[PDB]
Ligand binder design. Structure first.
Ligand SMILES: C[C@@H](N)[C@H](N)C(=O)NS(=O)(=O)OC[C@H]1O[C@@H](n2cnc3c(N)ncnc32)[C@H](O)[C@@H]1O
Length: 422
């Protein structure tokens, strides 16, 4: 057999994109708790109304904003960030996360490469730093002000193929590359995760990742598509392991995603302080981003025996993950830990340099087609052409193929194994 797994078309995604699923819940159950950020709690209705005031004031200030318009957002992770992103999506536009800690020259490159039409900051950022001529800047605090006449849904038409966000790399070499992600790819990642994490209206999901990382998107919004609650854990909280663990206990958190080094810090703390309260409501811990090892996973399972663990793998360019490896405490967990099974609506291949699939068990490049393959890198046609190419394989979407630059191999059962960088 050849190293091919095909799941294009496997999962129906429903009629509604992410912002509209949130709107559905706000209409059906307005008083459910939607989002908590430290001392601030919003019901679905409060969050929706505030996002609508922002959206309507944005359309007043920028009447030409809409489909594929890119808006920079330089607001720290918070209720304010969630509200601003939701507002941008409601008016048909897409956003670029620009963490306030990033220096001005990085902001400039991100806005310039993206052709951004405007920048939204919060009051603290506006007071610390000047606007730049030619880049309209508007302030969250003004956009969100009370006005009961501005609280209805904008009801702008959104298509699945429209951009939802552009996420720039944050390495130490070259100009940053801004991956273009579309609403339908973002939705597909969320739909797969909601199923594999067994989510429901009682789910309580942590938003702990930096806004410079694409995983912060599904973390912020997945619960809002299900009637559950997002808990935003900012940098001050995440930097205090003891404090984050206590918060997860008090909040009865059910879903947490981390990288392996942070997982290690959590495991070490709980092993060193067995008297302390633990995240006993967690149903799933997801680890992603770098290679995880079996011994660390088994140490986690000893501490959180009621949880399952997902090893999640994929590139930002394909809307977050393309494989999930689901593990239960009783499983035979050994090194190397698999990266797992293709998400629905993708096809994954292990190929040689000419994109020819290799026999099962042979190492080659991981490449992917399907609904979540994004558009490329904004303002960079050459770099785009290096990794985004026309698929030579059957396709039911837009014919896109993404070369990950990762080496891997496929087992006979279709499970994928990660073998480093090509
Ligand atoms: C992972 C996504 N949830 C997230 N969107 C993200 O990390 N995107 S990414 O584009 O920034 O990095 C992607 C690059 O990291 C590497 N990698 C990612 N996961 C794993 C993993 N489980 N085991 C080993 N290595 C991994 C790999 O080399 C890969 O290509």
């Amino acid at each position: 057999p050849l190293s091919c797994v095909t799941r294009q078309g496997d999962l129906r995604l429903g009629r509604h994109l992410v912002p509209h699923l949130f709107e559905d819940h706000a209409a059906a159950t307005p008083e459910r708790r939607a989002l908590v950020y430290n001392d601030r709690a919003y019901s679905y209705d409060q969050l929706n109304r505030a996002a609508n005031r922002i959206a309507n004031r944005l359309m007043q200030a920028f009447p030409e904003l809409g489909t594929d318009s890119l808006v920079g957002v330089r607001i720290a992770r918070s209720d304010r960030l969630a509200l601003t992103v939701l507002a941008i999506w409601k008016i048909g536009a897409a956003y670029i996360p620009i963490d306030p800690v990033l220096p001005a020259q990085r902001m400039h490159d991100m806005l310039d490469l993206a052709g951004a039409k405007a920048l939204i900051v919060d009051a603290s950022v506006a007071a610390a730093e000047p606007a730049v001529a030619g880049m309209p800047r508007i302030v969250f605090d003004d956009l969100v002000m009370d006005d009961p006449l501005l609280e209805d849904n904008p009801e702008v038409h959104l298509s699945g193929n429209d951009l939802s966000y552009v996420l720039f790399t944050s390495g130490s070499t070259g100009k940053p590359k801004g991956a273009m992600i579309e609403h339908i790819g973002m939705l597909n990642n969320i739909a797969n995760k909601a199923l594999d994490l067994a989510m429901d209206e009682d789910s309580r999901v942590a938003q702990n990742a930096s806004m410079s990382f694409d995983v912060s998107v599904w973390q912020m919004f997945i619960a809002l598509t299900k009637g559950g609650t997002t808990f935003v854990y900012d940098d001050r909280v995440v930097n205090d392991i003891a404090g984050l663990i206590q918060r997860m206990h008090t909040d009865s958190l059910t879903i947490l995603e981390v990288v392996p080094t942070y997982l290690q810090a959590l495991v070490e703390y709980m092993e060193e302080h067995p008297d302390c309260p633990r995240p006993a409501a967690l149903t799933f811990m997801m680890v992603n981003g770098e290679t995880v090892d079996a011994a660390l996973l088994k140490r986690w399972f000893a501490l959180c025996p009621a949880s399952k663990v997902i090893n999640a793998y994929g590139p930002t360019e394909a809307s977050d993950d393309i494989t999930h490896h689901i593990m239960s405490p009783g499983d035979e967990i050994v090194n190397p830990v698999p990266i797992g099974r293709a998400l629905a609506n993708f096809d994954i291949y292990i190929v040689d340099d000419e994109l020819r699939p290799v026999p099962i068990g042979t190492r080659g490049e991981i490449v992917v087609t399907g609904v979540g393959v994004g558009r490329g890198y904004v303002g960079m046609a050459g770099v785009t052409a290096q990794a985004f190419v026309k698929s030579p394989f059957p396709d039911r979407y837009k014919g896109r193929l993404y070369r990950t630059g990762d080496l891997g191999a496929m087992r006979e059962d279709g499970v994928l194994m990660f073998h480093g960088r090509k």
